[PDB]
Amino acid sequence: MKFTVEREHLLKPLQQVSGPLGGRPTLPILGNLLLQVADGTLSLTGTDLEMEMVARVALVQPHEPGATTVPARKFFDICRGLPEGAEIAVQLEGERMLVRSGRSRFSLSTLPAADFPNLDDWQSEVEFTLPQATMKRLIEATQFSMAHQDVRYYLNGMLFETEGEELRTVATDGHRLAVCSMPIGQSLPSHSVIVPRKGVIELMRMLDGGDNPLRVQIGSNNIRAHVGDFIFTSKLVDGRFPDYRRVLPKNPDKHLEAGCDLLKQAFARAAILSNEKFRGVRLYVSENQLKITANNPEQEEAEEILDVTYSGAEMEIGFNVSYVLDVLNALKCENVRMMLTDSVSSVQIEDAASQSAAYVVMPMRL
Amino acid sequence: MKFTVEREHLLKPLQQVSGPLGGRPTLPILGNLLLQVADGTLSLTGTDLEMEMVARVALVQPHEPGATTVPARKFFDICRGLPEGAEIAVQLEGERMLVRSGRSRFSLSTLPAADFPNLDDWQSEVEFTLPQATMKRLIEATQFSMAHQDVRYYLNGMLFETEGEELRTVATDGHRLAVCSMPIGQSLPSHSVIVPRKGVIELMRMLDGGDNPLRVQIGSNNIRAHVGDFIFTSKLVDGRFPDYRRVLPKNPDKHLEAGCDLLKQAFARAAILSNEKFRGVRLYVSENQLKITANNPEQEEAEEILDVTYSGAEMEIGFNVSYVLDVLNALKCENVRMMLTDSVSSVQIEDAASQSAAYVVMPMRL
Ligand SMILES: CCC/C(=N/OCc1ccc(-c2ccc(F)cc2)cc1)[C@@H]1C(=O)CC(C)(C)[C@H](C#N)C1=O
Ligand SMILES: CCC/C(=N/OCc1ccc(-c2ccc(F)cc2)cc1)[C@@H]1C(=O)CC(C)(C)[C@H](C#N)C1=O
C-alpha cells in the first residue's frame, strides 16, 4: 500500500472519520483508522462498533493497493501539523506505516486491516434524498428532548419516521417530548426506526452548508447517510418507541401567545431563583398577562410579569423551567403559542406561525 | 442601603469582583459579594481570604448608605439577564435584598456585612506605576514556567523583582526557568516578592486593554494593584526564591539560531511520537543543521531536519519537548537563539533580536 496525496485533500476526510471512536475505546483498534487503497481511491474508515464513517479520496498520483490500520489521532496530528501545501507520501512497510513529507518522516505502528471491525452487509428497505438543511432542522428541533442514560434504551435515541411524503423526528424523556416533520417531495412507505444517541450526533456532524444532498437508506437494523464522498452507517436501536400521537394533549382549548424572546428571558431570570435540583416555576395566566414566580429552599424569590395574548380562564401551572427554556431555545421564532388544558395536564408549545414542530411538557405538581 | 444604577454600569464591576477558580466556597459568606453604599459610591467586594477584589461605582441617582452581602453568582446572573439599558434599583429589606427592574422583582438572601471577611490594613513599602501592557508582557513571558503543587511551595508562585528602573518576573519549577525584565522609567529600591499562582491569575484578568495604568503597592506580606476603579490585593508567598542569576548557564559558547515558527512546528510534529509521560526528544546539531528525533514505547519514530545557523561542535542533547514548545510558544518572535554548552548542561533560549526574556531548560537523559 502506497499513496501520495496533498495534505489539504486529507484534512477534512480525516476529521470526518475520527468523529466516531471510544476512549481507549477499551478496544484499542477502535482508536485506529482503516486505510484502503483500491482503484484510484483511498478510503478512510473509523468505527466505534455501533456506527462507521467512511470517506473516499481520489488518488491522482501513483499508488499501489492494499490496506492497513493506523492510530487515528496521531496520523491526523501529523498531517495537520505539516505546512500548508505539503505532499504526503505514505507507504506500508512491514508492521509499520511510513509517512514522509519534506524532510519530516514518521513511522506509526499498525494493526492488521483483516482485524478491523466490519459492520455486516444489510439490505436497505426505504431510501430517500433530502436537503442537508432539512435533516439539520429535523435534528435541531428535537435532539434536546432525548433521554440520557435511561433504562428504556430506546428513549436515549431519536425516532425517524417516514409517513406519506414527510420525514419526522420524535424525541422524548418520559417527561417532555419534541416532534418535527418536514415535507420531502417523495412518496415513501410507512416506516419507523430509532437512531441511537451517538448516531444522531454523527449525522448532524456530517452536515456542511453546501449543495450536496443527503441520500438516506434505512434497513431493518441500520441506517446509512451519504453526502458527497462521506458515508455514515449506524446500527438502529431495537425496541418500540412511544406514539407521539398519544402524547399530544387531547383538548388544549386555552391558548396563550407571547413574544419568544421576552418569554425566554423572563423564564431565564426566574430560573436563577428556582430550586437547583427540581427547577420548579409557577405560571399564573390571567387576561392578557403572564406571571412567573420562582422560589428556593433559601427562601429566595423571583417574579416576572409580561403582557401576552390570552382570553381564557385564569389558571396556575408549575413547570420544570429547564424543560420550558429548552423548548423556547429550540423554537427560534418571533412568537410562541402555549396550548393549555388545566393545571394537571401537559402543555403544548409551538411557533405561533408554524406547525412543523410541537413540544409537549408535563406540568409539575406545585 | 438603597441604590439605582444602570445595568451596563454594574456588568463590568460584577465580573471583575467575581474571581474564577474559586468555585467551591469553604465558608458560605465567601460565596457572597459585599455591597457598600457610602459617600455617593457603591463598592462591590469579592474575597477568598488570600485575595480580595474591590470595584467602585459612582452613584448619580438618589441612594442611601449601608451595606449587606448577597450570593455573588445569583446577583450577577440577575443583572446580566435583564435587558440592555435596564435600570436596577436595589434596596435592602430585612434579611433580604430586593432587586427590581421593569416588572422583574427578585429577593436574595443576605449575610451580615459586619460578618464579611476583612483583609487587615497593612503598609506599603514600594510603589510604582506601569502600563497594563508591560504587566501583561511580564506575566505571559514567564507564567507557564511556574511549578504547580511542588513541596517547595515558593516555586508555585511568581517572583516580582524591582531593580534599578526595571520590574522583572521569574518563574521556575526546578526543571525549567523563565525570566523577563521590562523598563518602567521610575528608579525603584531593590526588592523581591513572591505572588501566589491565583494572584498572578487575578493580576492578568484585571488587564483590559485600556490605558488605565496599574498603580502597584507592595508591603511585607501583601501586594495591591489599582487599575481605574478596581483594586486588587493578594497575600504574598512567604519564602525565599531561587536566584535566576544562578540558573542561567555559566557560559554557553555554542549558539544556534533558527526561525521560530519552523523550529516550533518541527518540534510539535516530533512530539506527537514522543513518550506521553516523559516527552523526550533528541536534538542532533551539526554545521547549519538540526535534526530532531522522537520515539515512544510502541517504537514509533519521528525525524525532522531543518536548516539553522550553527558553527560549533556536533552534539546530541535530549529535552522534554513540552518545555521546549512552551518556550517557543511564549517567544513570539521571528528567530530564536539556543545557547548550548554540552550534552548534560541546561540550554538557554531567547529571541535572537531581544534580551528582554531568557529561558533555561535542563536537558533530559534519554
Ligand atoms: C411499554 C411501553 C410503555 C410506554 N412508554 O412510553 C414512555 C413515555 C411516557 C410518557 C411520555 C410523556 C412525554 C411528554 C408528556 F408531556 C407526557 C408524557 C413519554 C414517554 C407508554 C406508551 O407507549 C404510550 C404512552 C401514552 C406514552 C404511555 C403513557 N402515559 C406509556 O407509558
Ligand atoms: C534551599 C535553596 C533551595 C534551592 N532551590 O532551588 C530550586 C531550583 C533548582 C533548580 C532549578 C533549575 C531551573 C532551570 C534549570 F535549567 C536547571 C535547574 C530551579 C529551581 C537552591 C537554590 O536556591 C540555588 C540553586 C542553584 C537554584 C540550587 C540548584 N541547583 C538550589 O537547589
Side-chain angles (χ1 to χ4, degrees), chain A, chain B residues 1-333 335-366:
Chain A
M1 195 204 66
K2 313 207 184 326
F3 62 86
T4 302
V5 53
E6 139 160 19
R7 168 179 174 273
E8 294 81 24
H9 295 157
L10 234 30
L11 262 8
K12 199 186 76 178
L14 288 185
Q15 172 235 73
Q16 204 69 231
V17 304
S18 319
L21 288 54
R24 194 170 53 77
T26 47
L27 195 63
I29 203 166
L30 273 22
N32 276 207
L33 297 182
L34 160 68
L35 270 68
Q36 294 160 134
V37 170
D39 153 52
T41 317
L42 197 207
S43 292
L44 315 160
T45 298
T47 184
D48 71 2
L49 256 36
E50 294 334 340
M51 52 194 193
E52 127 204 307
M53 180 62 107
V54 191
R56 269 82 160 80
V57 3
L59 300 172
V60 33
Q61 305 189 43
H63 56 272
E64 288 173 12
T68 192
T69 268
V70 276
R73 272 160 212 86
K74 292 170 162 157
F75 180 54
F76 176 70
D77 290 347
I78 292 174
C79 288
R80 178 178 35 101
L82 278 171
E84 178 153 315
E87 294 288 354
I88 307 186
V90 169
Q91 79 172 55
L92 167 68
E93 179 91 27
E95 260 58 91
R96 304 219 99 85
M97 194 176 88
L98 279 30
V99 185
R100 312 147 18 220
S101 176
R103 304 197 285 175
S104 319
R105 302 183 35 97
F106 308 88
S107 329
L108 307 176
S109 38
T110 58
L111 253 16
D115 304 349
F116 198 82
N118 208 129
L119 280 52
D120 289 335
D121 297 331
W122 48 277
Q123 169 67 48
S124 80
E125 292 309 336
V126 191
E127 298 187 339
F128 56 86
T129 75
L130 71 174
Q132 289 182 77
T134 304
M135 187 62 83
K136 173 158 148 80
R137 192 313 99 113
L138 248 0
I139 295 170
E140 302 185 302
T142 59
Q143 197 172 193
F144 67 91
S145 273
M146 311 165 290
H148 297 278
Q149 308 175 327
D150 195 295
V151 180
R152 307 124 131 183
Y153 48 110
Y154 42 90
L155 297 185
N156 300 320
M158 181 180 285
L159 183 81
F160 276 77
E161 186 175 3
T162 69
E163 165 162 76
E165 292 189 85
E166 293 222 79
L167 177 60
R168 148 158 76 249
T169 41
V170 181
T172 184
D173 239 359
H175 305 285
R176 35 79 98 99
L177 177 134
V179 196
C180 180
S181 337
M182 291 289 278
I184 65 168
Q186 272 146 112
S187 199
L188 277 7
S190 297
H191 203 105
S192 272
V193 302
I194 314 161
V195 172
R197 162 149 263 97
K198 279 196 141 203
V200 173
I201 293 323
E202 278 288 301
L203 251 342
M204 189 71 139
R205 185 174 289 166
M206 302 168 94
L207 277 19
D208 65 22
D211 253 351
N212 278 167
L214 182 59
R215 195 178 84 216
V216 181
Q217 306 173 291
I218 303 173
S220 56
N221 300 95
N222 303 82
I223 182 169
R224 161 169 294 125
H226 184 281
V227 181
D229 300 308
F230 302 85
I231 299 152
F232 166 76
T233 311
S234 184
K235 283 149 87 136
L236 267 359
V237 184
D238 190 55
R240 92 151 282 288
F241 200 88
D243 182 355
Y244 73 97
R245 303 158 184 82
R246 297 265 288 121
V247 171
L248 248 38
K250 56 197 274 194
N251 40 77
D253 63 14
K254 308 162 136 95
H255 293 171
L256 169 161
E257 197 191 302
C260 195
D261 180 84
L262 283 176
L263 212 52
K264 172 207 293 187
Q265 306 317 330
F267 279 113
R269 292 182 303 257
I272 297 159
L273 304 186
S274 66
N275 178 310
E276 311 190 329
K277 217 301 186 55
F278 305 104
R279 316 235 68 223
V281 295
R282 273 183 57 88
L283 262 74
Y284 299 83
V285 202
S286 63
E287 151 130 276
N288 289 142
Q289 183 185 278
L290 176 69
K291 178 178 274 171
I292 307 158
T293 49
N295 53 261
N296 63 26
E298 291 108 314
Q299 311 268 215
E300 296 172 326
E301 198 164 323
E303 160 224 274
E304 294 292 337
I305 306 168
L306 52 161
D307 293 338
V308 305
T309 303
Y310 187 66
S311 271
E314 305 186 356
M315 42 171 306
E316 127 54 32
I317 191 160
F319 280 114
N320 178 312
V321 70
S322 284
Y323 292 165
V324 171
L325 287 167
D326 285 356
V327 167
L328 296 184
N329 271 45
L331 284 169
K332 312 170 338 275
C333 57
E334 306 176 19
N335 304 292
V336 172
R337 172 174 314 95
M338 311 185 147
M339 306 149 52
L340 299 300
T341 296
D342 58 21
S343 100
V344 104
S345 306
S346 67
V347 154
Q348 181 163 321
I349 313 178
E350 34 184 74
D351 180 343
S354 164
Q355 292 79 211
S356 275
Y359 299 92
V360 176
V361 184
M362 175 176 320
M364 220 173 59
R365 166 84 233 143
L366 138 159
Chain B
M1 188 199 94
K2 192 146 167 188
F3 62 84
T4 298
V5 187
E6 235 219 20
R7 163 179 178 280
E8 293 70 28
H9 298 159
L10 249 24
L11 261 15
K12 184 202 201 60
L14 258 21
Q15 157 236 282
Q16 211 62 264
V17 295
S18 308
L21 214 308
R24 304 288 175 253
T26 320
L27 292 151
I29 200 163
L30 262 31
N32 280 12
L33 291 183
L34 171 66
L35 271 52
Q36 293 165 126
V37 177
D39 276 350
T41 307
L42 161 63
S43 297
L44 312 155
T45 297
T47 189
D48 75 1
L49 267 37
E50 186 188 49
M51 58 190 186
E52 136 191 304
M53 179 67 155
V54 189
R56 323 211 94 96
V57 343
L59 262 5
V60 308
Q61 327 194 50
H63 52 269
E64 168 201 306
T68 194
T69 78
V70 270
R73 258 108 312 200
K74 309 174 202 181
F75 179 57
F76 180 69
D77 291 345
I78 294 190
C79 300
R80 202 193 85 184
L82 289 167
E84 174 151 332
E87 287 297 341
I88 306 179
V90 171
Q91 78 168 70
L92 155 75
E93 182 90 17
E95 268 80 280
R96 302 265 172 236
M97 192 179 89
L98 275 30
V99 182
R100 85 207 144 74
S101 178
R103 304 144 94 188
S104 309
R105 307 181 86 230
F106 311 88
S107 169
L108 306 166
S109 66
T110 59
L111 264 6
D115 294 354
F116 197 79
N118 220 310
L119 277 59
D120 292 326
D121 323 77
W122 46 273
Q123 170 62 53
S124 70
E125 296 315 322
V126 187
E127 301 185 338
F128 53 88
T129 103
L130 90 166
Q132 304 192 13
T134 303
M135 184 54 84
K136 180 171 161 92
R137 172 65 215 270
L138 251 359
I139 289 172
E140 288 171 347
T142 61
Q143 178 169 196
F144 66 87
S145 282
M146 286 169 307
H148 296 282
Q149 282 157 204
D150 203 292
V151 292
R152 330 108 123 179
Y153 62 93
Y154 44 94
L155 300 188
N156 302 321
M158 181 178 287
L159 180 71
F160 280 74
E161 187 173 0
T162 61
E163 179 169 63
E165 305 188 62
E166 262 181 335
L167 204 209
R168 162 160 58 249
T169 44
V170 17
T172 187
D173 62 7
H175 312 284
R176 35 80 177 271
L177 180 141
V179 38
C180 182
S181 337
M182 289 291 276
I184 69 158
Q186 289 141 97
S187 202
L188 318 324
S190 303
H191 193 102
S192 276
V193 294
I194 311 164
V195 182
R197 155 184 323 287
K198 270 208 176 85
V200 172
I201 292 286
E202 281 289 311
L203 289 166
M204 197 64 127
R205 166 191 307 143
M206 61 171 330
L207 274 22
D208 64 26
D211 60 354
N212 288 164
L214 286 278
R215 178 180 124 206
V216 176
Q217 304 179 106
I218 312 184
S220 19
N221 300 125
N222 294 99
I223 184 167
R224 175 182 299 122
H226 187 289
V227 201
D229 308 296
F230 282 111
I231 306 168
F232 170 72
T233 307
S234 182
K235 309 298 212 357
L236 261 5
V237 179
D238 181 55
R240 153 188 28 105
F241 199 87
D243 184 347
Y244 75 88
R245 278 150 300 242
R246 227 56 315 262
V247 185
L248 261 32
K250 306 174 157 89
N251 195 202
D253 55 15
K254 308 171 140 95
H255 298 347
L256 169 150
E257 188 194 301
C260 194
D261 188 66
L262 243 24
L263 203 59
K264 199 187 53 183
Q265 312 311 335
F267 280 111
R269 291 189 297 272
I272 294 159
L273 294 190
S274 62
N275 184 300
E276 308 188 344
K277 188 166 179 120
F278 299 117
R279 305 230 90 200
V281 297
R282 307 219 252 216
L283 279 63
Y284 305 79
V285 49
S286 68
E287 158 131 297
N288 297 311
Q289 186 180 111
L290 173 67
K291 166 155 80 131
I292 307 159
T293 46
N295 58 78
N296 56 31
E298 315 95 89
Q299 304 146 226
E300 300 177 321
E301 315 205 60
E303 165 214 281
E304 284 301 333
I305 312 169
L306 66 160
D307 292 340
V308 303
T309 305
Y310 186 69
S311 268
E314 304 189 352
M315 244 184 78
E316 160 155 50
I317 184 167
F319 281 97
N320 177 326
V321 71
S322 293
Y323 298 164
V324 163
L325 254 5
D326 285 351
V327 166
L328 297 172
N329 288 316
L331 289 167
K332 278 177 286 32
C333 55
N335 305 115
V336 39
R337 161 150 46 255
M338 318 191 155
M339 299 150 49
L340 307 134
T341 306
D342 58 22
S343 99
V344 293
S345 318
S346 58
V347 50
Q348 180 166 139
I349 309 187
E350 337 187 280
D351 190 336
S354 172
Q355 283 76 200
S356 277
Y359 298 96
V360 172
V361 177
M362 54 159 68
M364 174 183 302
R365 39 155 134 67
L366 257 313

PDB file of all heavy atoms in Angstrom, chain B residues 229-244:
ATOM      1  N   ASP B 229     -11.169  52.025  38.512  1.00  0.00           N
ATOM      2  CA  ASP B 229     -11.966  51.931  39.745  1.00  0.00           C
ATOM      3  C   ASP B 229     -12.016  50.506  40.331  1.00  0.00           C
ATOM      4  O   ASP B 229     -13.005  50.134  40.988  1.00  0.00           O
ATOM      5  CB  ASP B 229     -13.395  52.492  39.524  1.00  0.00           C
ATOM      6  CG  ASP B 229     -13.382  53.875  38.928  1.00  0.00           C
ATOM      7  OD1 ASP B 229     -12.869  54.796  39.618  1.00  0.00           O
ATOM      8  OD2 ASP B 229     -13.835  54.034  37.775  1.00  0.00           O
ATOM      9  N   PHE B 230     -10.937  49.756  40.094  1.00  0.00           N
ATOM     10  CA  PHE B 230     -10.820  48.355  40.502  1.00  0.00           C
ATOM     11  C   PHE B 230      -9.578  48.278  41.302  1.00  0.00           C
ATOM     12  O   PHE B 230      -8.600  48.869  40.908  1.00  0.00           O
ATOM     13  CB  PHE B 230     -10.632  47.422  39.274  1.00  0.00           C
ATOM     14  CG  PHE B 230     -11.846  47.163  38.567  1.00  0.00           C
ATOM     15  CD1 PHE B 230     -12.059  47.670  37.298  1.00  0.00           C
ATOM     16  CD2 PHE B 230     -12.844  46.404  39.161  1.00  0.00           C
ATOM     17  CE1 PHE B 230     -13.267  47.405  36.645  1.00  0.00           C
ATOM     18  CE2 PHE B 230     -14.065  46.164  38.470  1.00  0.00           C
ATOM     19  CZ  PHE B 230     -14.256  46.644  37.240  1.00  0.00           C
ATOM     20  N   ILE B 231      -9.633  47.588  42.449  1.00  0.00           N
ATOM     21  CA  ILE B 231      -8.460  47.430  43.307  1.00  0.00           C
ATOM     22  C   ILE B 231      -8.319  45.997  43.738  1.00  0.00           C
ATOM     23  O   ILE B 231      -9.210  45.452  44.350  1.00  0.00           O
ATOM     24  CB  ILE B 231      -8.495  48.336  44.573  1.00  0.00           C
ATOM     25  CG1 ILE B 231      -8.724  49.828  44.176  1.00  0.00           C
ATOM     26  CG2 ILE B 231      -7.212  48.200  45.363  1.00  0.00           C
ATOM     27  CD1 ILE B 231      -9.038  50.662  45.344  1.00  0.00           C
ATOM     28  N   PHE B 232      -7.171  45.400  43.434  1.00  0.00           N
ATOM     29  CA  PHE B 232      -6.903  44.006  43.761  1.00  0.00           C
ATOM     30  C   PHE B 232      -5.801  43.900  44.751  1.00  0.00           C
ATOM     31  O   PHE B 232      -4.756  44.516  44.588  1.00  0.00           O
ATOM     32  CB  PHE B 232      -6.519  43.223  42.508  1.00  0.00           C
ATOM     33  CG  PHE B 232      -5.984  41.805  42.780  1.00  0.00           C
ATOM     34  CD1 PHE B 232      -6.845  40.777  43.218  1.00  0.00           C
ATOM     35  CD2 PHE B 232      -4.644  41.521  42.564  1.00  0.00           C
ATOM     36  CE1 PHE B 232      -6.364  39.486  43.471  1.00  0.00           C
ATOM     37  CE2 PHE B 232      -4.145  40.234  42.785  1.00  0.00           C
ATOM     38  CZ  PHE B 232      -4.982  39.205  43.213  1.00  0.00           C
ATOM     39  N   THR B 233      -5.975  42.999  45.723  1.00  0.00           N
ATOM     40  CA  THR B 233      -4.989  42.792  46.780  1.00  0.00           C
ATOM     41  C   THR B 233      -4.791  41.306  46.970  1.00  0.00           C
ATOM     42  O   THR B 233      -5.817  40.566  46.953  1.00  0.00           O
ATOM     43  CB  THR B 233      -5.469  43.466  48.141  1.00  0.00           C
ATOM     44  OG1 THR B 233      -5.793  44.844  47.868  1.00  0.00           O
ATOM     45  CG2 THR B 233      -4.363  43.432  49.161  1.00  0.00           C
ATOM     46  N   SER B 234      -3.526  40.878  47.194  1.00  0.00           N
ATOM     47  CA  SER B 234      -3.241  39.440  47.451  1.00  0.00           C
ATOM     48  C   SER B 234      -2.256  39.303  48.591  1.00  0.00           C
ATOM     49  O   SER B 234      -1.381  40.155  48.768  1.00  0.00           O
ATOM     50  CB  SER B 234      -2.666  38.793  46.163  1.00  0.00           C
ATOM     51  OG  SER B 234      -2.407  37.400  46.302  1.00  0.00           O
ATOM     52  N   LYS B 235      -2.371  38.240  49.391  1.00  0.00           N
ATOM     53  CA  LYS B 235      -1.234  37.861  50.172  1.00  0.00           C
ATOM     54  C   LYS B 235      -0.070  37.509  49.264  1.00  0.00           C
ATOM     55  O   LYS B 235      -0.232  37.078  48.126  1.00  0.00           O
ATOM     56  CB  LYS B 235      -1.553  36.658  51.102  1.00  0.00           C
ATOM     57  CG  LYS B 235      -2.804  36.893  51.923  1.00  0.00           C
ATOM     58  CD  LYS B 235      -2.716  38.112  52.881  1.00  0.00           C
ATOM     59  CE  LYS B 235      -3.553  37.859  54.166  1.00  0.00           C
ATOM     60  NZ  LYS B 235      -4.272  36.524  54.072  1.00  0.00           N
ATOM     61  N   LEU B 236       1.103  37.675  49.838  1.00  0.00           N
ATOM     62  CA  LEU B 236       2.351  37.269  49.258  1.00  0.00           C
ATOM     63  C   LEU B 236       2.730  35.908  49.759  1.00  0.00           C
ATOM     64  O   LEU B 236       2.123  35.387  50.700  1.00  0.00           O
ATOM     65  CB  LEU B 236       3.371  38.302  49.649  1.00  0.00           C
ATOM     66  CG  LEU B 236       3.698  39.387  48.605  1.00  0.00           C
ATOM     67  CD1 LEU B 236       2.904  39.441  47.270  1.00  0.00           C
ATOM     68  CD2 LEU B 236       4.033  40.686  49.216  1.00  0.00           C
ATOM     69  N   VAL B 237       3.639  35.254  49.051  1.00  0.00           N
ATOM     70  CA  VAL B 237       4.127  33.936  49.495  1.00  0.00           C
ATOM     71  C   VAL B 237       5.365  34.207  50.285  1.00  0.00           C
ATOM     72  O   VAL B 237       6.297  34.893  49.842  1.00  0.00           O
ATOM     73  CB  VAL B 237       4.467  32.966  48.339  1.00  0.00           C
ATOM     74  CG1 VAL B 237       4.991  31.614  48.881  1.00  0.00           C
ATOM     75  CG2 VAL B 237       3.250  32.719  47.472  1.00  0.00           C
ATOM     76  N   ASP B 238       5.375  33.679  51.488  1.00  0.00           N
ATOM     77  CA  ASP B 238       6.445  33.958  52.378  1.00  0.00           C
ATOM     78  C   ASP B 238       7.473  32.839  52.260  1.00  0.00           C
ATOM     79  O   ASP B 238       7.285  31.770  52.867  1.00  0.00           O
ATOM     80  CB  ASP B 238       5.905  34.057  53.830  1.00  0.00           C
ATOM     81  CG  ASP B 238       7.000  34.369  54.822  1.00  0.00           C
ATOM     82  OD1 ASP B 238       7.688  35.379  54.600  1.00  0.00           O
ATOM     83  OD2 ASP B 238       7.197  33.614  55.801  1.00  0.00           O
ATOM     84  N   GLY B 239       8.526  33.076  51.480  1.00  0.00           N
ATOM     85  CA  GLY B 239       9.654  32.164  51.372  1.00  0.00           C
ATOM     86  C   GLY B 239      10.813  32.813  50.630  1.00  0.00           C
ATOM     87  O   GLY B 239      10.764  33.984  50.284  1.00  0.00           O
ATOM     88  N   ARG B 240      11.881  32.080  50.395  1.00  0.00           N
ATOM     89  CA  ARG B 240      12.946  32.672  49.621  1.00  0.00           C
ATOM     90  C   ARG B 240      12.934  31.954  48.284  1.00  0.00           C
ATOM     91  O   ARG B 240      12.591  30.779  48.208  1.00  0.00           O
ATOM     92  CB  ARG B 240      14.272  32.692  50.406  1.00  0.00           C
ATOM     93  CG  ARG B 240      15.618  32.685  49.618  1.00  0.00           C
ATOM     94  CD  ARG B 240      16.857  32.498  50.574  1.00  0.00           C
ATOM     95  NE  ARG B 240      16.541  31.757  51.808  1.00  0.00           N
ATOM     96  CZ  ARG B 240      16.874  30.482  52.077  1.00  0.00           C
ATOM     97  NH1 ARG B 240      17.562  29.737  51.201  1.00  0.00           N
ATOM     98  NH2 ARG B 240      16.513  29.943  53.248  1.00  0.00           N
ATOM     99  N   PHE B 241      13.190  32.709  47.230  1.00  0.00           N
ATOM    100  CA  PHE B 241      13.027  32.244  45.868  1.00  0.00           C
ATOM    101  C   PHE B 241      14.439  31.996  45.313  1.00  0.00           C
ATOM    102  O   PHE B 241      15.373  32.737  45.696  1.00  0.00           O
ATOM    103  CB  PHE B 241      12.244  33.336  45.026  1.00  0.00           C
ATOM    104  CG  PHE B 241      11.630  32.775  43.763  1.00  0.00           C
ATOM    105  CD1 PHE B 241      10.363  32.209  43.778  1.00  0.00           C
ATOM    106  CD2 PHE B 241      12.353  32.753  42.555  1.00  0.00           C
ATOM    107  CE1 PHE B 241       9.843  31.629  42.592  1.00  0.00           C
ATOM    108  CE2 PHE B 241      11.820  32.152  41.422  1.00  0.00           C
ATOM    109  CZ  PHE B 241      10.562  31.629  41.444  1.00  0.00           C
ATOM    110  N   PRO B 242      14.612  30.991  44.411  1.00  0.00           N
ATOM    111  CA  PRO B 242      15.927  30.818  43.704  1.00  0.00           C
ATOM    112  C   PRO B 242      16.393  32.071  42.935  1.00  0.00           C
ATOM    113  O   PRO B 242      15.596  32.767  42.254  1.00  0.00           O
ATOM    114  CB  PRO B 242      15.663  29.675  42.681  1.00  0.00           C
ATOM    115  CG  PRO B 242      14.300  29.198  42.881  1.00  0.00           C
ATOM    116  CD  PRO B 242      13.564  30.110  43.864  1.00  0.00           C
ATOM    117  N   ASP B 243      17.679  32.350  43.012  1.00  0.00           N
ATOM    118  CA  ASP B 243      18.259  33.394  42.204  1.00  0.00           C
ATOM    119  C   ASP B 243      18.371  32.975  40.721  1.00  0.00           C
ATOM    120  O   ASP B 243      19.120  32.073  40.401  1.00  0.00           O
ATOM    121  CB  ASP B 243      19.651  33.713  42.769  1.00  0.00           C
ATOM    122  CG  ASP B 243      20.322  34.871  42.067  1.00  0.00           C
ATOM    123  OD1 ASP B 243      19.860  35.306  40.968  1.00  0.00           O
ATOM    124  OD2 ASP B 243      21.338  35.323  42.600  1.00  0.00           O
ATOM    125  N   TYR B 244      17.675  33.644  39.800  1.00  0.00           N
ATOM    126  CA  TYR B 244      17.720  33.212  38.413  1.00  0.00           C
ATOM    127  C   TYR B 244      19.180  33.268  37.914  1.00  0.00           C
ATOM    128  O   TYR B 244      19.601  32.481  37.046  1.00  0.00           O
ATOM    129  CB  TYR B 244      16.774  34.035  37.545  1.00  0.00           C
ATOM    130  CG  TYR B 244      17.256  35.415  37.241  1.00  0.00           C
ATOM    131  CD1 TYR B 244      18.077  35.647  36.122  1.00  0.00           C
ATOM    132  CD2 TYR B 244      16.965  36.489  38.095  1.00  0.00           C
ATOM    133  CE1 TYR B 244      18.547  36.932  35.803  1.00  0.00           C
ATOM    134  CE2 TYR B 244      17.436  37.821  37.785  1.00  0.00           C
ATOM    135  CZ  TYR B 244      18.218  38.009  36.646  1.00  0.00           C
ATOM    136  OH  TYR B 244      18.681  39.251  36.316  1.00  0.00           O
TER     137      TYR B 244
END
